[PDB]
Amino acid sequence: SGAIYVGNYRVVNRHLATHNDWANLVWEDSSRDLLVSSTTAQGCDTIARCDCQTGVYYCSSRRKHYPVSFSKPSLIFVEASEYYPARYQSHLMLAVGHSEPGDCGGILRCQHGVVGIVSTGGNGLVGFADVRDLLWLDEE
Ligand SMILES: CSc1ccccc1N(C)C(=O)N1CC[C@H](C(N)=O)C1
Ligand SMILES: [Zn+2]
């Protein structure tokens, strides 16, 4: 589990969005596994606006933050799970690192701020849904 809190927005994995989230929807994209809901209080996370390919992510199944190198956002095939059939997920970045299903939502950060959240993984890999292209998260 986990979320990004920027301005009056809450960014979570779409497959983990609560009942409170769909009743306050701003934008969602199933192909990206992202959902953004509106919040009453202002958040303090800064979104990175960069092309970094190294950062640090939080891994809840190990209670540890790990430094990682990751690929640029791309269209990647993701196996079937209880949340989606087998499909291509877009804007996904992969790294070599530990992840278990409940690690989704952990933040990936670089020197510029938040890059994305854990969204996929297994077999010694971890995949992150990029949020750096969502420029509107910074305004209105
Ligand atoms: C860190 S995800 C993970 C970890 C280890 C094993 C498997 C996983 N997968 C694949 C997983 O449970 N999902 C649920 C939905 C998600 C998605 N974006 O499609 C992927
Ligand atoms: Zn950066």
UniProtKB/Swiss-Prot annotation:
Binding, Zn(2+) 1: 50, 52, 110, 112
The UniProt entry's coiled-coil ranges are none
Q: Which reaction does it catalyse?
A: Selective cleavage of Tyr-|-Gly bond in the picornavirus polyprotein
Which residues does UniProt mark as catalytic? 15, 33, 104
What is this protein's function per UniProt? Answer: Cysteine protease that cleaves viral polyprotein and specific host proteins. It is responsible for the autocatalytic cleavage between the P1 and P2 regions, which is the first cleavage occurring in the polyprotein. Also cleaves the host translation initiation factor EIF4G1, in order to shut down the capped cellular mRNA translation. Inhibits the host nucleus-cytoplasm protein and RNA trafficking by cleaving host members of the nuclear pores. Counteracts stress granule formation probably by antagonizing its assembly or promoting its dissassembly.
Q: How does it assemble?
A: Homodimer.
The protein's name: Protease 2A
| Organism name | Coxsackievirus A16 (strain G-10)
Q: Which residues of the full protein are shown?
A: 869 to 1008 of 2193
